[PDB]
Design a protein around this nucleic acid. Structure first.
Length: 35
DNA sequence: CTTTGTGTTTGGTGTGTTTGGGTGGTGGCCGTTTTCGTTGTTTTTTTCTGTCTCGTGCCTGGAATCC
């Protein structure tokens, strides 16, 4: 679990469809409406 | 067939008169109503008792989203 969390979070440090950090934020903070 | 005009008859009421009686102004007898003295009273004025009110010692007083 820690390994998976790090393997997912580390690539986020290097990054009209919403993509990248705002889209990952929508996904993890499960939103009732999206951009 | 049957309505009104009255023919005739009878009851209600407008006047007049005599009579009488239910009842109207005075009188004088009596216990009623009224006024004075007595008793309770209550509430308004005066009084007896503690918050306000103004001077001290000290020592605290001051940029979106989701739930």
């Amino acid at each position: 679990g820690v390994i998976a969390a790090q393997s997912i979070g580390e690539p986020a440090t290097q990054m009209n469809v919403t993509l990248g950090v705002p889209r990952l934020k929508e996904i993890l903070n499960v939103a009732k409406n999206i951009k």
